[PDB]
């Protein structure tokens, strides 16, 4: 259950990014794996996610219509691309799969967090 | 094993700031590193263990990162109780060498 993520870099608020979070030590399930940023001197927050079975999208209020994702199950790996990027999406992005998409009571998962490649916004 | 060096032996900076200290290896160590904390005339205090791992109770603006030979410390933003000395161990075999460490300082 180890989860490496890269794709990061410095760019202008507008221009397009695409990262990645590759899952290694992960048996094959229908792990639903959200995200999370964090800014220096405060808690935690949760942005989004996308359970099994494909479709099944969700996000939060202000990360709506602006996010495009695709998932491969096949190369143990994610591709997300951003649109209208802003000056608050300064962010280290982890993905967490919570690791327990049981069939029965399949929310309350436990997260678990990776390592994450940090995305610098300035204009 | 363990011949350790490390660069800045010493630092200024201000509340909020973004600090760093690096701690080299002369050959593979793999990334099992340690960070450590040390307040003049008390206890040492520990912040990360493995150079990945954030532990239970310590906050998470200390982060580590580095594999191979070169490793780093990164501090978001400096606080009041950061003002302290750093240190950086391996346990592979049992001899036991020590290194000289850091110090910050107000500016």
């Known amino acids: 259950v180890q989860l490496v993520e890269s794709g990061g870099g410095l760019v202008q608020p507008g221009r397009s990014l695409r990262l990645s979070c590759a899952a290694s030590?992960?048996?094959?399930?229908?792990?639903?794996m959200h995200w999370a940023r964090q800014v220096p001197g405060k808690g935690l927050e949760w942005v989004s996610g996308?359970?099994?079975?494909?479709?099944?999208?969700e996000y939060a209020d202000s990360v709506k219509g602006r996010f495009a994702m695709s998932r491969d199950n096949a190369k143990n790996s994610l591709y997300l691309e951003m649109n209208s990027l802003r000056t608050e999406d300064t962010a280290l992005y982890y993905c967490?799969?919570?690791?327990?998409?049981?069939?029965?009571?399949?929310?309350?998962?436990?997260?678990?967090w990776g390592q994450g490649t940090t995305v610098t916004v300035s204009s | 094993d363990i011949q350790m060096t490390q660069s800045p032996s010493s630092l200024s900076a201000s509340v909020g700031d973004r600090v760093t200290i690096t701690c080299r290896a002369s050959q593979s160590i793999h990334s099992f590193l340690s960070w450590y904390q040390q307040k003049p005339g008390k206890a040492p205090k520990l912040l990360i263990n493995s150079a990945s791992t954030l532990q239970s109770g310590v906050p998470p603006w200390f982060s580590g990162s580095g594999s191979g030979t070169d490793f780093t410390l990164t501090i978001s933003s400096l606080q009041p109780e950061d003002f302290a000395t750093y240190y950086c161990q391996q346990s592979y075999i049992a001899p036991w060498t020590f290194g000289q460490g850091t110090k910050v300082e107000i500016k």
């Open positions: 967490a799969k919570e690791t327990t998409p049981w069939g029965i009571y399949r929310s309350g998962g436990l997260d678990v």
């Open positions: 030590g992960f048996n094959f399930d229908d792990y639903a």
């Open positions: 996308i359970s099994g079975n494909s479709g099944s999208v």
